């Protein structure tokens, strides 16, 4: 059965990007999915996205700009400190500062770059490059 | 639990017999008139240690990291391997 | 997929997104509660009461009407029945499963060689045990409650 909506949404986005789609729908919706989409749009990996209510968890409509090489959730959500980011960067990214590691911290979910700037750690929830 | 054992200060080549490496090392030996290959390997590992230190320090953050970077640059300049206005790169 | 048969059947109800009762409903919330109570007195289960309200009286669903006694919740057939004190003592689905399980046992005792029906009975009892565990966890039924066919005979009777 359904276990990880975040992983489902990220895999769906990756497959749609590979096929060359321009629009995608994500279901079920959640605050975590919304915040991850917000971060991705902030970094320019996706286009406009909106929320649709249907009497259920809700749906997300996302525009794809053909800028994502690969996006995927990280399981298990490993905790990470401020000084222990290089190993994860090497594991999940091609080059230094190439992609982004979406991390859930005590001050909201933000990219590992913002986490390092704020000097706080968290748990790796996703990655995209 | 074992005590300290003094280690070698040079590293032997991974493969004893490689054509290009043998030719290059022979040219260097003939040019600089060294007694044997262990001296050349000692200098090669000195260079390797310097390069490894620079690589490690490039991606390091912290007061100790800055101190070590400055010390490495100062030591190289004192030895004369780099100009006065050199940079870690 | 299905719990046991393991095949994907996507047949069901398609509820439109709504946030308030339709404007063309001819009955008030009090009248809806009265209808629910009278149907329960007649003897229909909750599902039948809902179906009758949807079909005959043109009430799409009681869940659309807000609860007049608790602003934090919407109405429901079971909630109305327990407001009037008519809520079932045992959950309806569990009771139905137990009833058909005892009927199947009655058939099997006369037909001991019906191994396929015996497997069906085994699946029914597994469903019953799952529901019993869930209800125990939620506190709906006493912790010392256990499913035993001998007692289930009297319970169904």
């Amino acid at each position: 059965t359904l276990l990880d909506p975040l992983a489902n949404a990220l895999s769906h986005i990756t497959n749609s990007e590979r096929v060359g789609k321009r629009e995608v729908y994500i279901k079920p919706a959640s605050k975590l999915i919304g915040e991850v989409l917000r971060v991705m749009q902030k970094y320019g990996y996706i286009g406009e996205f909106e929320f649709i209510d249907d009497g259920r968890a809700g749906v997300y409509r996302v525009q794809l700009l053909g800028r994502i090489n690969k996006a995927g959730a990280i399981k298990p959500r490993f905790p990470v400190k401020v000084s222990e980011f290089e190993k994860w960067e090497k594991r999940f990214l091609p080059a230094f500062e190439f992609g982004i590691l979406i991390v859930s911290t005590s001050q909201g979910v933000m990219s590992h770059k913002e986490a390092i700037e704020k000097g706080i750690g968290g748990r790796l929830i996703a990655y995209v490059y | 639990g074992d005590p300290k054992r003094q280690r070698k200060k040079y590293e032997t080549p991974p493969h004893p017999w490689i054509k290009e490496r043998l030719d290059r090392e022979r040219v260097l030996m003939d040019k600089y008139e060294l007694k044997n290959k262990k001296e050349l390997w000692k200098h090669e590992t000195q260079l390797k240690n310097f390069r490894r230190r620079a690589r490690r320090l490039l991606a390091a953050r912290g007061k100790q990291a800055e101190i070590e970077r400055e010390q490495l640059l100062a030591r190289l300049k004192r030895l004369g391997l780099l100009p006065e206005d050199a940079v870690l790169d | 997929a299905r719990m046991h048969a393991r095949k994907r059947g996507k047949s069901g109800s398609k509820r439109p997104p709504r946030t308030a009762p339709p404007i063309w409903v001819e009955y008030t919330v009090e009248e809806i509660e009265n209808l629910v109570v009278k149907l329960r007195k007649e003897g229909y289960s909750t599902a039948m009461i809902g179906t009758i309200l949807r079909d005959q009286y043109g009430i799409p669903s009681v869940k659309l009407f807000k609860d007049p006694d608790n602003p934090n919740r919407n109405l429901t057939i079971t909630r109305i029945l327990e407001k009037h004190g008519l809520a079932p003592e045992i959950p309806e689905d569990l009771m139905f499963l137990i009833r058909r399980a005892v009927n199947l046992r009655k058939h099997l005792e006369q037909h001991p060689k019906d191994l396929h029906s015996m497997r069906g009975l085994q699946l029914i009892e597994s469903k019953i045990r799952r529901l019993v565990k869930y209800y125990k966890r939620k506190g709906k039924l006493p912790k010392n409650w256990r499913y035993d066919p001998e007692t289930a005979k009297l319970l169904v009777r």
């Binding site: 800028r67 090489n69 090497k90 091609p94 080059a95 230094f96 190439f98 | 390069r51 490039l58 991606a59 | -």
Partner: protein, 228 residues
């Protein structure tokens, strides 16, 4: 300069046969970067010989494998030579070819010709955590290449660190222009053809990754020939 007169002489002696050949001879095309990324077909080696004449240097031509091959007939064994060769300039243009013949020389000429026809364009840079300069001495970022059962992963490496890859892989990379890289291979690397083609695909895939304009400045990405 010598390669420049070689190009002049071959241009004088060359009569066009294809549309691209006529275009080059007329002069609408004057740089090698203009023949790629347009969907054209390269069926005539004179175009490569003219636009990138340095590929004809013996030091720039390498033979990677020579294989004896046999087929059975009622009269005995028929023996053929398969030669895998690589060509290109040490500035971002490389090509790989396979040639079959009745003799090693015929196979070698055919293989070099096919490599010239198969020449491609790659992107270089620096994306290593330990280097972080802006020179095109390595691959800009980690890339993958698969052929047969051989999977090759190329990772950026710091300047001064040589090619940490099998002999044929480092030969291909040296011909392309790269001089610092780490490798990670899976499968039967002893199959020279498959390994070389996997390295070729890994180098080619550098063009299949989307990069923002800032990444070019960050990694010093250079496409094809550099400041040269």
């Amino acid at each position: 300069q010598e390669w420049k007169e070689y190009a002049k002489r071959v241009l004088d002696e060359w009569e066009p046969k294809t549309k691209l050949g006529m275009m080059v001879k007329e002069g609408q095309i004057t740089d090698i970067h203009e023949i790629f990324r347009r969907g054209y077909q390269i069926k005539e080696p004179e175009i490569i010989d003219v636009l990138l004449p340095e590929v004809n240097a013996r030091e720039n031509q390498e033979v990677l494998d020579i294989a004896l091959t046999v087929r059975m007939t009622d009269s005995g064994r028929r023996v053929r030579f398969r030669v895998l060769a690589a060509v290109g300039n040490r500035d971002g243009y490389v090509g790989l070819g396979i040639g079959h013949g009745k003799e090693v020389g015929i196979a070698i000429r055919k293989a070099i010709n096919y490599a010239k026809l198969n020449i491609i364009e790659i992107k270089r840079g620096c994306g290593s955590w330990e280097c972080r300069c802006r020179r095109p001495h390595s691959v800009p970022f980690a890339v993958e290449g698969k052929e047969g059962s051989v999977r090759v992963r190329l990772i950026p490496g710091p300047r001064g660190l040589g090619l940490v890859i099998g002999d044929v892989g480092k030969k291909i990379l040296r011909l392309a222009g790269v001089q610092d890289v780490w490798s990670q291979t899976f499968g039967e690397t002893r199959t020279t053809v498959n390994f070389a083609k996997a390295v070729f695909n890994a180098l080619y895939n550098t063009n299949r990754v989307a990069i923002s304009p800032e990444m070019i400045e960050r990694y010093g990405i250079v496409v094809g020939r550099a400041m040269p």
